[PDB]
Design a protein around this ligand. Structure first.
Ligand SMILES: O=P(O)(O)O[C@@H]1[C@@H](OP(=O)(O)OP(=O)(O)O)[C@H](OP(=O)(O)O)[C@@H](OP(=O)(O)O)[C@@H](O)[C@H]1OP(=O)(O)O
Ligand SMILES: [Cl-]
Ligand SMILES: [F-]
Ligand SMILES: [Mg+2]
Ligand SMILES: [Mg+2]
Ligand SMILES: [Mg+2]
Length: 134
């Protein structure tokens, strides 16, 4: 069940899944629409779902990882696609082998140095590139 802010924007949450507290490498996942493209794992908040709970859930589902939830980076709107995404930092402590999207749609995951994550998101996901700006 998709959920929405009062202005009709889809509510979403995502994590910047860092390899360590140094925040030098981040985990991206393959796009479901176009698997040759990278995205920040994330998705829809469920009804009455806390943003930080949605964020942690979606990354488990999409990236097959778990860890220590960190700070909220900010809230990011995609005017074109009408969504508003809460973005949190998650320091990965568990990397799991056969996660929901690997099983169901063969979703891929890869570590990127931050500067490279920004590069591969720029073309199709400029708002997700902006998650890294601060
Ligand atoms: O399939 P996902 O989870 O990776 O993400 C998809 C969105 O799913 P999202 O990550 O928001 O939700 P969830 O399915 O909960 O992860 C979906 O959003 P939706 O509109 O709800 O179908 C969106 O559609 P858009 O809003 O029309 O841009 C795109 O299909 C997007 O595909 P991707 O970025 O190419 O992987
Ligand atoms: Cl790191
Ligand atoms: F999802
Ligand atoms: Mg999802
Ligand atoms: Mg998603
Ligand atoms: Mg979902």
């Amino acid at each position: 069940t998709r959920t929405y802010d009062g202005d009709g924007y889809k509510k979403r949450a995502a994590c910047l899944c860092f390899r360590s507290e140094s925040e030098e490498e981040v985990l991206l996942v393959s796009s479901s629409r176009h698997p040759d493209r990278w995205i920040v794992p994330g998705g829809g908040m469920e009804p009455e779902e806390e943003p930080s709970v949605a964020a942690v859930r979606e990354v488990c589902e999409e990236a097959g990882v778990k860890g220590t939830l960190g700070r909220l980076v900010g809230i990011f709107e995609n005017q074109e696609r009408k969504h508003r995404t809460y973005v949190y930092v998650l320091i990965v402590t568990e990397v799991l082998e056969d996660w929901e999207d690997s099983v169901n749609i063969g979703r891929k995951r890869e570590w990127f140095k931050i500067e490279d994550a920004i590069k591969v998101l720029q073309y199709h996901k400029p708002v997700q590139a902006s998650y890294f700006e601060t």
